[PDB]
Design a protein around this ligand. Structure first.
Ligand SMILES: CCCCCCCCCCCCCCCCCC(=O)OC[C@H](COP(=O)([O-])OCC[N+](C)(C)C)OC(=O)CCCCCCCCCCCCCCCCC
Ligand SMILES: CCCCCCCCCCCCCCCCCC(=O)OC[C@H](COP(=O)([O-])OCC[N+](C)(C)C)OC(=O)CCCCCCCCCCCCCCCCC
Ligand SMILES: CCCCCCCCCCCCCCCCCC(=O)OC[C@H](COP(=O)([O-])OCC[N+](C)(C)C)OC(=O)CCCCCCCCCCCCCCCCC
Ligand SMILES: CCCCCCCCCCCCCCCCCC(=O)OC[C@H](COP(=O)(O)OCCN)OC(=O)CCCCCCCCCCCCCCCCC
Ligand SMILES: NC(=O)C1=CN([C@@H]2O[C@H](COP(=O)(O)OP(=O)(O)OC[C@H]3O[C@@H](n4cnc5c(N)ncnc54)[C@H](OP(=O)(O)O)[C@@H]3O)[C@@H](O)[C@H]2O)C=CC1
Ligand SMILES: CCCCCCCCCCCCCC(=O)SCCNC(=O)CCNC(=O)[C@@H](O)C(C)(C)COP(=O)(O)O
Ligand code: SF4
Ligand code: SF4
Ligand code: SF4
Ligand SMILES: [Zn+2]
Lengths: 342, 157, 126, 96, 208, 146, 48, 114, 178
């Protein structure tokens, strides 16, 4: 290898981990955690960004001096994508929206941008490309986003043949769109679950676990060309999961069995917004799609991460949503949700 | 280009003009450099003329002038009062101590630069930087937040 | 009534606050420092010193400076006596390597040997 | 003078430049690497040789106390001029 | 006469030597050494158990009246058995004089606190404990005063590194200021600024 | 002045042969795995070691223990010393037994088959010092060398 | 500097530059020292 | 081989002081977890207290263990009166530090540090 | 000698006029009215505010600002890589490496100043034997990133080329004191 890419130090802030990683979805929810881990171990992290320097400026302290390179990029600019991936050996793709704008739709975001990034990366000569799709993105799913991510997986594997495809489940964290969403149902009268929240199984995975998995994929020699499944340790029904969320929030719980078609109607009613929508039709379809069982795919165990349970890491998310009455409540004051083997 | 882009740009220019014409520091200093920031508040330089008025609580504060040495006993308080400010919050580091540790860079009890704790928007060098230099930093911050285009990036989204 | 009896090695490592790595994995060197041959002055070879084993120094990615990860790289401790250095090292729990002081050997100097009648010590120049 | 590498990056007067495959040029991407355009090596190569008459010349760099500590250069070797160790100005004795 | 040499007065040296003899013969139980420097400063070195009688006598004696404690500090000389040399600087406003009282301690022998004599000794002994680890008996509230909360080790000791063992930085994963083992972008360059030629023949030690 | 050889022609990464026969860089795990696999493939007489000149005693005893554990005794050095007779069995047979203090103490020295000025410059300097002061009788079997 | 202009030198800038931070013209630090330890290059010819 | 005691004449009285300090810490841990909004549970804090005590368990000198009791009592008081914060409490867990493995292969693969 | 700041001399007794004066002082707020009048005088004075950035605060030729590396009138850099500034630098903000140049002169290949670590004390410019490193009076060089405040040899030489017009003039005006 090169003389400047040899790792040095004891793995701290000022150390050299010998990885030059271009992280494309670094501004969003998972991106800040993966950039935090990369800069923690000490890395050359390139952040191509689209939004304001103020909006990315929370990432400025994630690493040492000169170890983070921020640069403009446009999703329609192959020249800018190539100039972002020109000096790198790991290219990490986290580009994604939960809705559709008039400039970018699901097909563009989950197919065209990852294909362009992988093509520029292959023509620039990187040796590791990591692409984060979603779990249960096989094909012919009931939502547009899952099908688009599946055909994006196909295109990414066709262009870059040894790309590490990571399929995490519904990621929960401090700034997620999952636990904060289910706690944001508290602003309405009831919780409108489809079939009262049953026949829908979920295993959420911690964002720090996903980020540690991505970093160990950057330094894993035998992970090339593989598809990993990043899932949590316990499978919960959707009803029991929302029940545990509202119990930890200590707010109230009134469930409501509401049919899926009119729930999709009110979902796209909320989604027809110029700003970031509270929910969309695709969002409620993703909520009510059950998670598949990962049998043959490797996971966080095979990639070197112990999955932290939601019961252990749930109070750093839901303590924001509780009132003053229940603010000083511990873990043991809320009964954990019942798990299911299936 | 189309009509809507020009309207968004002019509205955004108005937004940024208000934001840079009214910026309030948190009444917060540490050392030598805090003596120099009150020398900038002194009548010669008139940060009040520039439109820049102290508010003690971080809830009414816009810009955080980290002026002095950040110690290990002070860093959690620094981060706390940074996080308790509202969303449009900007940070100016003042002096060599807040920039990169300064004259106590090799100390056991000194944070090597306040950017290890808070995201620093601009850096003002000197030990202490004169009130001239801090006024220069404040005007540079005004130009920097004049440069941003939140509404325009939102429309391009 | 104010004297108790202990039969131990005076271990204060739990009171020093040093982490376990920098106690167990460190080797100190106790010696009188050698006189540098660029000068003839010998005032620096009078006090005993302990230093620590050298750890890794690498190059900074940004500027190229000498980055380090150990705290005890510039640690030099001075002592009046070798047994005092042994006492300090055993009290602080560091394994030590001790070099005996290299005193210069006394030698016979005579200006008249430069002008010998028969010996080879006569010099051909001045 | 300044020269450019095959990678297109200009070379400083110290002579250092990043390699083609060096990852540290992303530091210069979308920015600039600045190099002082005035090189001291050729800026002395354009300096004329000071022609004096004495066997030992004294140099202070000019300006008196604004220059360097004054040194004495011995101009005996006819095959090589005498150079001040501080300012680099060459001196030559007259053999005519 | 000499404009570059500090003028000296022998009268102050004689008065301080006479008072040193006076204190030494008044308190032979604890006074181990009495010396007067070339700078006309009086130092009495005493046993650690005699700190309370010595300070009380110096404060409450009519001929001493050292009612003001200038400072309390410690010096770490880690080549002797009792490595912490504890120094009390005292001021007499009645007689316009200054005295220094020295004692010794090591890492496991505390000495008596003089808070009952001087109230400034409270914070000064808190500083001494925080910086050097010397415990003080019968202190009202002996705790750390200058180091960070939960700081392990006493940083003014000689064997403690200059940069320390941990540093603080903000972690966004846990949203907290957290401590990490020390890593420096540029290591502190140790300079050997000691000439191998003897500077002061009056302080030439005999060979070992 | 030969310390600047430690700045050029240096091995920094482990290398292995390709499938075409060229040396390319690899990881420590891969290099040690290949060498260990070959070592487990081959038996005691089939594996041997040879040591050069700039080698410490720690690596020598480590390689000795490794080849003794795979039952290999072909532990050779590239410098030749006679093996029969006493050989390396007796420590007086291969050692400067008189030592450099004995260089100062002797009065007649006989150098057989060596050029001490270049083979051991400080030992030759001590010979010259004792020749100048104590008047050694130095004699030589070998080529006429300054 | 109209009655007492400064001394003219051929390395002084003919054109001044203002503070060019947050621009493509800004100063970016780098190491001005060349490579020190040189790796041994293996030959490109196989032995067999 | 005769020294001057600090508080305890022998190791048994100092062990009694250690036991009393452990009682006070074990009582305080639920109050700390309730008052400062800590991620940990009551079991994790008591396990951490036990871990620190067992870390210091190898001491057999009465003066050293008396000073350890003194330091533990100051930490306890600094926990009673809220001077240590959430960050100061969570520095005991090292949850951001990747631990160095104790095996020779990992020590060899990372770097030259033994 | 000494004096009392609050101890009054004897007593002013009790007189009817003095009692009336004290009653007027307490009731009609006389000291409050005169404080109002003095603040009114400040209102009618002229402010001491200069019009930054069009008016700049006055300075002196000794002012320690942004660092610079000077050259000789021939254009050769004054620094001779003697590392005296790095030795004297109290904050250890100077890093120097050097080698013989192509013509044999001893010039720096690396003269870095961490200006976030600098304390701007002038020890380097008073320790330099050849007036190579100086503190030009530029203070208006605040940046937006921490990296670009870490100065290397090229930046320092380029700044010395930029500010040579007033650095030489200031050294001419002040050098006779130093
Ligand atoms: C005189 C007193 C009353 C004054 C009333 C207000 C007068 C001016 C009214 C018209 C302009 C109002 C715009 C204010 C927007 C302020 C917030 C902002 O810029 O948000 C940026 C954001 C940008 O959103 P975004 O989609 O870029 O996302 C950024 C958020 N993260 C980084 C978390 C993903 O919002 C907008 O641009 C909203 C535009 C609203 C336009 C309404 C017309
Ligand atoms: C609206 C019209 C204009 C109004 C005035 C506006 C301009 C002036 C503003 C001045 C600045 C005020 C700022 C706030 C000041 C607060 C302090 C303050 O005022 O304290 C009050 C001070 C307090 O005094 P004090 O506090 O110093 O007194 C000591 C009191 N103890 C010991 C209890 C603390 O004075 C008063 O309370 C006096 C009130 C007014 C009394 C007026 C009496 C007038 C005469 C009556 C008739 C007399 C003759 C009777 C007949 C005789 C016949 C023989
Ligand atoms: C009301 C006054 C407002 C401020 C006016 C100018 C201030 C400066 C005047 C000059 C000065 O300093 O004098 C010091 C002097 C005080 O000096 P002195 O403090 O040294 O006291 C004089 C000496 N002895 C103690 C003996 C009295 O002020 C005066 O003499 C007058 C003070 C009392 C009058 C004002 C207060 C009562 C007013 C009540 C009616 C309101 C007026 C009408 C308002 C209409 C509009 C609202
Ligand atoms: C309405 C949409 C346009 C709003 C203004 C956009 C242009 C702008 O901001 O121009 C800047 C101009 C002067 O402001 P500034 O640059 O701070 O001046 C430096 C003086 N030393 O700003 C101005 O001249 C002030 C503009 C005010 C516009 C009206 C605000 C509400 C009343
Ligand atoms: N969040 C979840 O529940 C899960 C998400 N994933 C996947 O993981 C990835 C990262 O997740 P997450 O952080 O939550 O997603 P976000 O919603 O936070 O967005 C991720 C990033 O994508 C960027 N981006 C989106 N659209 C565009 C576009 N058209 N052009 C340029 N940049 C764009 C955004 O940049 P900017 O800020 O500039 O707009 C943002 O930084 C996504 O691909 C997501 O589908 C997988 C499993 C679960
Ligand atoms: C919220 C979480 C915060 C955690 C805070 C941790 C506080 C740490 C306090 C540390 C207090 C001490 O370590 S002082 C006690 C040390 N002394 C000893 O261990 C004495 C020697 N040890 C022993 O004798 C041990 O065997 C025992 C177990 C103590 C006694 O066993 P016996 O049975 O033979
Ligand atoms: S940078 Fe200098 S002036 Fe400012 S606080 Fe630090 S020491 Fe004081
Ligand atoms: S700047 Fe001056 S003091 Fe520093 S190395 Fe160069 S010549 Fe020496
Ligand atoms: S001004 Fe002082 S602190 Fe700054 S570089 Fe010069 S000597 Fe160092
Ligand atoms: Zn000269």
């Amino acid at each position: 290898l090169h003389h400047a890419v040899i790792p040095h130090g004891k793995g701290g802030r000022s150390s050299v981990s010998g990885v030059v990683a271009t992280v494309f979805g670094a501004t969003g929810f998972l991106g800040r955690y993966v950039v935090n881990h990369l800069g923690r171990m000490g890395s050359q992290v390139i952040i191509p960004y689209r939004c304001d320097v103020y909006d990315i400026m929370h990432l400025r302290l994630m690493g040492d001096l000169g170890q983070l390179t921020f640069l403009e990029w446009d999703a329609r600019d192959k020249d800018s994508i190539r100039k972002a991936v020109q000096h790198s050996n790991v290219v990490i793709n986290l580009i994604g929206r939960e809705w559709e704008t008039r400039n970018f739709d699901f097909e563009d975001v989950f197919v065209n941008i990852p294909r362009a990034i992988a093509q520029a990366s292959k023509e620039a000569g990187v040796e590791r490309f990591i692409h984060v799709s979603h779990l249960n993105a096989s094909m012919k799913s009931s939502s547009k986003s899952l099908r688009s991510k599946a055909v994006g997986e196909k295109e990414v594997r066709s262009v870059f043949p040894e790309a590490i495809i990571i399929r995490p489940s519904d990621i929960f964290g401090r700034e997620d769109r999952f636990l904060n969403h289910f706690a944001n149902y508290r602003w309405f009268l009831a919780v409108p679950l489809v079939s009262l929240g049953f026949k829908t199984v979920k295993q959420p995975v911690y964002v720090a676990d996903v980020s540690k998995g991505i970093v160990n994929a950057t330094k894993d020699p035998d992970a090339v060309g593989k598809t990993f499944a990043f899932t949590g340790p316990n499978r919960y029904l959707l009803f029991h999961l929302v029940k545990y969320i509202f119990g930890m929030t200590h707010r109230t719980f009134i469930p409501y069995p509401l049919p899926l078609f009119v729930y999709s109607w009110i979902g796209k009613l909320f989604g027809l917004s110029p700003f970031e929508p509270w929910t969309t039709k695709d969002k409620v379809e993703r909520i009510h799609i059950s998670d598949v069982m990962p049998t043959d795919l490797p996971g966080l165990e095979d990639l070197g991460v112990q999955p932290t349970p939601l019961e252990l890491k749930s109070i750093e998310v839901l303590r924001r949503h509780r009132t003053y009455r229940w603010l000083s409540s511990e873990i043991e004051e809320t009964k954990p949700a019942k798990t299911v083997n299936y | 280009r189309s009509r809507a882009e020009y309207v968004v740009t002019k509205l955004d220019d108005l937004i940024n003009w208000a934001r840079r014409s009214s910026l309030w520091p948190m009444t917060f200093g540490l050392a030598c450099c805090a003596v120099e920031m009150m020398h900038m508040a002194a009548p010669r330089y008139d940060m009040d003329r520039f439109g820049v008025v102290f508010r003690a609580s971080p809830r009414q504060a816009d810009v955080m002038i980290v002026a002095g040495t950040l110690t290990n006993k002070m860093a959690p308080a620094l981060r706390k009062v940074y996080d308790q400010m509202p969303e449009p919050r900007y940070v100016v580091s003042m002096g060599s101590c807040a920039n990169g540790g300064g004259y106590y860079h090799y100390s056991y009890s000194v944070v090597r630069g306040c950017d290890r704790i808070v995201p620093v928007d601009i850096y003002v060098p000197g030990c202490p930087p004169t009130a001239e230099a801090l006024l220069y930093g404040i005007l540079q911050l005004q130009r920097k937040i004049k440069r941003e285009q939140k509404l325009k990036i939102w429309y391009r989204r | 009534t104010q004297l108790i009896t202990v039969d131990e090695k005076l271990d204060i490592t739990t009171l020093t606050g040093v982490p376990e790595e920098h106690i167990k994995t460190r080797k100190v060197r106790i010696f009188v420092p050698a006189r540098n041959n660029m000068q003839s002055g010998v005032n620096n070879t009078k006090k005993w010193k302990m230093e620590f084993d050298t750890r890794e120094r690498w190059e900074n990615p940004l500027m190229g400076w000498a980055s380090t990860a150990d705290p005890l790289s510039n640690m030099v401790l001075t002592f009046s006596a070798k047994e005092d250095a042994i006492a300090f090292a055993e009290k602080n729990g560091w394994s030590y390597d001790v070099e005996e002081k290299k005193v210069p050997k006394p030698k016979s100097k005579s200006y008249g040997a430069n002008f010998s009648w028969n010996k080879r010590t006569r010099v051909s120049t001045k | 003078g300044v020269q450019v590498s095959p990678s297109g990056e200009k070379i400083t007067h110290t002579g250092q430049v990043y390699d083609e495959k060096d990852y540290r040029r992303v530091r210069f991407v979308d920015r600039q690497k600045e190099v002082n355009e005035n090189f001291a090596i050729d800026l002395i190569a354009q300096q004329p040789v000071n022609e004096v008459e004495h066997r030992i010349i004294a140099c202070d760099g000019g300006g008196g106390a604004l220059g360097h500590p004054k040194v004495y250069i011995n101009l005996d070797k006819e095959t090589k001029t005498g150079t001040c160790g501080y300012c680099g100005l060459q001196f030559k004795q007259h053999h005519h | 006469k000499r404009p570059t040499v500090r003028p000296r007065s022998d009268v102050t040296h004689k008065q301080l030597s006479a008072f040193g003899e006076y204190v030494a013969e008044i308190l032979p139980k604890y006074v181990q050494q009495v010396q007067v420097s070339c700078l006309d400063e009086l130092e009495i070195c005493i046993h650690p158990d005699g700190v309370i009688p010595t300070l009380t006598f110096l404060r409450d004696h009519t001929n001493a009246q050292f009612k003001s404690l200038a400072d309390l500090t410690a010096v770490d000389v880690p080549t002797r058995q009792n490595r912490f040399e504890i120094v009390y600087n005292l001021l007499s406003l009645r007689f316009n004089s200054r005295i220094r009282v020295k004692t010794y301690a090591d890492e496991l022998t505390p000495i008596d606190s003089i808070v009952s004599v001087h109230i400034a000794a409270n914070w000064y002994e808190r500083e001494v404990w925080d910086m050097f680890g010397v415990f003080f008996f019968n202190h009202p509230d002996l705790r750390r005063i200058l180091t960070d909360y939960g700081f392990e080790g006493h940083p003014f000791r000689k064997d403690f590194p200059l940069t320390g063992y941990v540093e603080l930085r903000y972690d966004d994963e846990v949203k907290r200021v957290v401590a990490e083992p020390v890593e420096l972008a540029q290591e502190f360059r140790k300079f050997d600024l000691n000439s191998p030629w003897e500077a002061f023949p009056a302080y030439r030690q005999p060979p070992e | 002045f030969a310390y600047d050889g430690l700045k050029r022609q240096r091995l920094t990464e482990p290398m292995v042969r390709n499938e075409k026969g060229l040396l390319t860089y690899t990881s420590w795990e891969d290099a040690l795995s290949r060498v260990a696999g070959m070592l487990q493939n081959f038996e005691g007489n089939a594996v041997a070691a040879i040591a050069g000149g700039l080698v410490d005693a720690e690596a020598l005893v480590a390689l000795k223990d490794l080849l003794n554990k795979v039952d290999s005794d072909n532990l050779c050095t590239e410098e030749i010393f006679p093996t029969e007779g006493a050989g390396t069995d007796l420590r007086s047979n291969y050692l400067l037994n008189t030592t450099i203090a004995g260089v100062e103490e002797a009065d007649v020295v006989l150098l057989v088959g060596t050029n001490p000025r270049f083979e051991a410059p400080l030992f030759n300097a001590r010979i010259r010092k004792s020749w100048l002061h104590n008047d050694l009788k130095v004699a030589l079997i070998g080529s006429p060398v300054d | 500097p109209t009655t007492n202009p400064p001394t003219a030198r051929k390395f002084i800038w003919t054109n001044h530059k203002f503070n060019v931070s947050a621009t493509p013209e800004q100063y970016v630090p780098y190491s001005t020292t060349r490579k020190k330890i040189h790796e041994w290059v293996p030959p490109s010819t196989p032995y067999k | 081989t005769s020294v001057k005691p600090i508080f305890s004449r022998d190791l048994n009285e100092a062990k009694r002081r250690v036991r009393e300090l452990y009682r006070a810490w074990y009582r305080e841990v639920p109050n700390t977890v309730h008052l400062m909004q800590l991620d940990i549970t009551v079991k994790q804090g008591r396990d951490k207290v036990r871990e620190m005590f067992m870390k210091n368990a190898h001491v057999t000198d009465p003066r050293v263990v008396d000073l350890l009791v003194i330091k533990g009592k100051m930490e306890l008081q600094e926990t009673i009166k809220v001077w240590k914060q959430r960050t100061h409490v969570m520095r005991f867990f090292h949850e951001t530090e990747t631990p160095r493995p104790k095996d020779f292969l990992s020590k060899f693969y990372m770097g030259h540090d033994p | 000698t000494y004096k009392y700041v609050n101890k009054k001399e004897q007593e002013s007794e009790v007189d009817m006029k003095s009692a009336t004066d004290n009653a007027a002082r307490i009731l009609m707020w006389t000291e409050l009215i005169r404080g109002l009048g003095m603040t009114l005088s400040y209102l009618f004075r002229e402010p001491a505010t200069i019009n930054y950035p069009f008016e700049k605060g006055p300075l002196s030729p000794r002012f320690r600002g942004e660092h610079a590396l000077r050259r000789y009138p021939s254009g050769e850099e004054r620094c001779i890589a003697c590392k005296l500034c790095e030795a004297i630098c109290p904050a250890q903000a100077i890093t120097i490496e050097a080698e013989p140049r192509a013509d044999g002169s001893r010039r720096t290949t690396r003269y870095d100043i961490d200006m976030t670590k600098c304390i701007y004390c002038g020890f380097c410019q008073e320790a330099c034997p050849v007036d190579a490193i100086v503190e030009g009076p530029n203070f208006e060089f605040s940046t937006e990133t921490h990296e670009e405040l870490l100065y290397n040899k090229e930046k320092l030489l380029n700044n010395g080329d930029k500010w040579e017009a007033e650095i030489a003039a200031n050294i001419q005006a002040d050098y006779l004191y130093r």
